[PDB]
């Protein structure tokens, strides 16, 4: 869906009222094109350009690296313990456990490669 | 030329008059809109918008 | 080398014992020593052909190639002392004042009468 | 012995198996496309038969006085060509005769070798003058030359009578000319206008006047014996009269040659095509021209080499050899054997040839039949460039990798003077009158001078070569003089060649002093001379009276006391130009004017930084580069002895200033340069606990750089650093770069490469879907093109640049070539630089480029004549004599087979530039439109065609250098509110870094990111271009930026409405939708609201 957008509404009455206003706008363009609105951009200026060429916020980057490393190590511990915590099947079959495997996703995708 | 306001597929025409330029011999921007149907939970009562401006 | 020098490098290494060991010697067998010599020869030729002679000298300054050999042959055998013993030249390229001077980082006198 | 000799011969043949195939194919091919028609042969032979009837029905006459001859020739219309000095009755006691002539034909058309030529060829016709007409003392004091002149003039007049009798004046025109540009020997040229008019066969028949076999003594005719009295001799005149005596045994023994060998005709045409493509012909080179070597001298050398040539009378060229084998034999002999300073050759053409190893400062080929010396007309510089070009042909044939037959036999290098040679100087000399010469000349032209250098053209040419070579010395390798304005054709009514151009009554307009320059010693400020002793030596005395006021006595840094002459280095004009101006001003004439305006304006177009002493800073100077190297070494020190939890490994720069490719010379604290922040990689030691997720991997990189910045600001607080983002590779948004500012005023951006990036990228390209495979392939292609291959390119190109210092200005200027032409932003920098380096590293068939203009003209010429669709660019990026072999050659060629089966029309790939540091060759040329690549090639084609049509001049060079501003649809002229020339570093100065990073970003210009974001939001429908170097391309103050626009025809056309179009739309009816031009224009206007000024549309 390139060059498109998605406008979510609150309820059916809202989306129905907006669709009625849009078909009335189409009829207004059909009958009298002068009453139509004007589109105004929030015009980017040198403040916006120095915002784009502006350095990053050090505390924002610091809290970002902290929280993402925390959740990432949580994920990595959970995956390795789950895969090498001796997963057994329902009818008495045992999953093969190996030296430093932390990834059942890599078990299945390495079977997919081979 | 001024009566193109509705497509046979079900799309509508939204023209907008732009602010003029100091050295250009108003101009119209064309946007399209249609309701979008889906069984997704977070995609309830949505407007599929086509040709978004900058 | 990449700057056309011909070089010969001698590297030496030592086995070590683990702390848990109670055996008073930690020898390596024949497959061990042959694989060890192979992989260090690999990293030697690969790195000297990935670098020039100038960057090679500044690479042998910190002895980070030996740390690389440890963290590469870590999966074979425990080692304590890994060293390059010798570096000998064989054939020198043709001298460039440009290369030597651009490494090193046009003169006028005093009018004798 | 014999058996091992057959073994080494079959070893030669086994090594020469495939080249035999390809070369027999090529030679039979080009000989098909060059060969004549037997129809042309028969037309012209019946023509010469009718002329033979005329020459046998011309009658004869006896002794008459010179005054009666003058009365006859003032009574009739034809003028006799008396060569200076004119004969006088006081020193001419004798009279004249004319009897039957001995008629023969000469030239390769008599050697049975006729070929088609665009301009025309020569079928020379020899008319031999009788021994009874010869007196027993005629070789002395120009008397035989007067007999030859009166013979020729009476023959022309009676031929004119017989021609107007035989009605042929409607088709047969007569003129006078010079055989091989010798001023003393005039011949006739009979041609036809438009049954015996042979215009389609395009010939022009020469009629000569010759002498018979063994008519004068070789003992008194040798070059060391005089012939003119008033003791020096006249070797050129002696050789002329002797070879005009023995053309005839030459052709009989060379018909003996043609009867002993078979493919001689084709081999001689190979030699003739070699000469006519490299630029040599048979004309005189002593008169300020180039030549002296045609098919005549060629076939004499050919017979001499079949006769032998070696030290011990051995055989080098066998009669059982082919055209190719004759060509390669003569070229190896001419490449390995010296004839001017080392030795000379000898042969009895009537025992077996022998080399004798004493030199006579003259090319010396000896036949003891009538004691001839064949190569006396070629000058020392002409034989020098001949043996260099022979070594070049030896290199071209020794290349067993490339197919260089095109570069040997398709390139007339004398199409462009400024592309064949390196340096050109325009010299205008208003001499005046031969009696005014004593005050208008600095040298002496007297009786002995006239005897040794019979033509004043020869004398001035030799003296200017002498003064220029003794002034320059080792600062050039080769020295040549072209003389513009020379004509060798004069009508029958004038006594000699007459003109009034060049400020005098002589036949030249001006002088082109042309130089093949030694690149390593070209910019030495000092000219070292002799040592210093108690008595003034001869070389010290000639140094003193050669230099005068510039001469001095100096001591060195070791204290060394020698004679030396220093100069002042200038950026706009070179030291070679200054010293040649000084020499040609003092030792030739005080009124001649010397200029090198093309090199002057090139060096003026090169930008200049705002550093002290930049005006007298040379072009090859590397001071700012050395200072940034020292600053980077200090930063290397600090961040190397930094302690990190993981032991650090590698800190390698990849910067353009380190690769000597920066546009603006890097000025300290110049924070408006796009090349201010140069990239340096930082590699760690290997470790097992790497994150196996790419986002957390780049976040681990940011944590590395975060503690790097923290420790840096904690220990070395003078250093200021910050963080900036890198979005050059898509879909990896967390590549955050560490920018560091040194107190010296330099910037470096740090990016970490490790073992897991390409592994996780391979995991992604294995996991992705087939429809998404080419996009991720392009991203990985750009990734490994920016990261590791750039490092390999940087190190090897740093080696090659320190070998070739003269690559650094042209690869800086080449960006300036296409920065002004809107086509750097679409193309990759490594691709552009390899196009810049190719003619330097492969100088076939040029000279090795030792000048900016020559190299850049070579570059643009190769882009223009690049048939990119067909032949791949294979480069061997090595220092001059790791090299690429035949297996890698065929592998790249089979990659090219996959290339032309994957994309024929250029719709996926255009330029296949490949070298050692890329097995791909496709790794760099993506991210480009085919209209843009074809537009680069066609713009180079326009440049070469304008070079071909309108010479070289300031207006054509400015038209090459200015943008066209045409073949785009819409153009937006923008402005920045503050000038940027001082902050970017060009002098027509910022003190230190400000206390505000937002103020740094305020000084930084957003035009590049604006244009790139517009290209990103409109990639499918638009192809935009602009300038990135505003401080150099923004006028006199540097605040101008121009955004042009191209629309694809795919969206110029009308297409149906879709939901995945990615463009601004407007409908025409219920189904058809086109683009909204005015909406796009108002969109970019609202984006650049405070910056837009001018806007035009077609």
UniProtKB/Swiss-Prot annotation, chain A:
Domain of life according to the entry: Eukaryota
According to the UniProt entry, the coiled-coil residues are none
State the compartments where it is located.
Nucleus, Nucleolus
What does the record's miscellaneous section state?
Answer: Present with 2610 molecules/cell in log phase SD medium.
Chain's role: Plays an important role in the synthesis of 18S rRNA but is not required for the 5.8S and 25S pathway. Is necessary for the cleavage at site A2. Is required for efficient association of RPS27 with the pre-ribosomal particle.
Q: How does it assemble?
A: Component of the 90S pre-ribosomal particle.
Which family, according to UniProt? Belongs to the RRP7 family.
> This chain belongs to which protein, by name?
Ribosomal RNA-processing protein 7
Q: Which organism is it from?
A: Saccharomyces cerevisiae (strain ATCC 204508 / S288c)
The lineage, from the top, is: Eukaryota, Fungi, Dikarya, Ascomycota, Saccharomycotina
Gene name, Swiss-Prot/TrEMBL: RRP7
Portion held of the full protein: 120 to 233 of 297
Curated annotation (Swiss-Prot), chain C:
Phosphothreonine: which positions carry it?
113
- Which modifications occur after translation, per UniProt? N-terminally acetylated by acetyltransferase NatA.
Q: Which cell locations does it reside in?
A: Cytoplasm
Q: Which family does it belong to?
A: Belongs to the eukaryotic ribosomal protein eS1 family.
Additional remark text: Present with 92400 molecules/cell in log phase SD medium. There are 2 genes for eS1 in yeast.
Subunit structure, as described in the record:
Component of the small ribosomal subunit (SSU). Mature yeast ribosomes consist of a small (40S) and a large (60S) subunit. The 40S small subunit contains 1 molecule of ribosomal RNA (18S rRNA) and 33 different proteins (encoded by 57 genes). The large 60S subunit contains 3 rRNA molecules (25S, 5.8S and 5S rRNA) and 46 different proteins (encoded by 81 genes). eS1 interacts directly with uS11 and eS26, which form part of the mRNA exit tunnel.
Quote the function comment for this protein: Component of the ribosome, a large ribonucleoprotein complex responsible for the synthesis of proteins in the cell. The small ribosomal subunit (SSU) binds messenger RNAs (mRNAs) and translates the encoded message by selecting cognate aminoacyl-transfer RNA (tRNA) molecules. The large subunit (LSU) contains the ribosomal catalytic site termed the peptidyl transferase center (PTC), which catalyzes the formation of peptide bonds, thereby polymerizing the amino acids delivered by tRNAs into a polypeptide chain.
Under what name is this protein listed?
Answer: Small ribosomal subunit protein eS1A
User: What is the organism of origin for this protein?
Assistant: Saccharomyces cerevisiae (strain ATCC 204508 / S288c)
UniProtKB/Swiss-Prot annotation, chain D:
Q: Which organism is it from?
A: Saccharomyces cerevisiae (strain ATCC 204508 / S288c)
Oligomer and partners: Interacts with snoRNA U3. Interacts with MPP10. Component of the ribosomal small subunit (SSU) processome composed of at least 40 protein subunits and snoRNA U3. Interacts with UBP10.
Any one GO biological process: maturation of SSU-rRNA
Q: What is this protein called?
A: U3 small nucleolar RNA-associated protein 22
Q: What else is known?
A: Present with 3260 molecules/cell in log phase SD medium.
| Organism ancestry | Eukaryota, Fungi, Dikarya, Ascomycota, Saccharomycotina
**Family from the record:** Belongs to the NRAP family.
| Annotated Gene Ontology cellular component terms | 90S preribosome; CURI complex; nucleolus; nucleoplasm; nucleus; small-subunit processome; UTP-C complex
GO function terms (MF aspect): RNA binding
Q: Does the keyword rRNA processing apply?
A: yes
What are the record keywords, sorted? Nucleus, Phosphoprotein, Ribonucleoprotein, Ribosome biogenesis, RNA-binding, rRNA processing
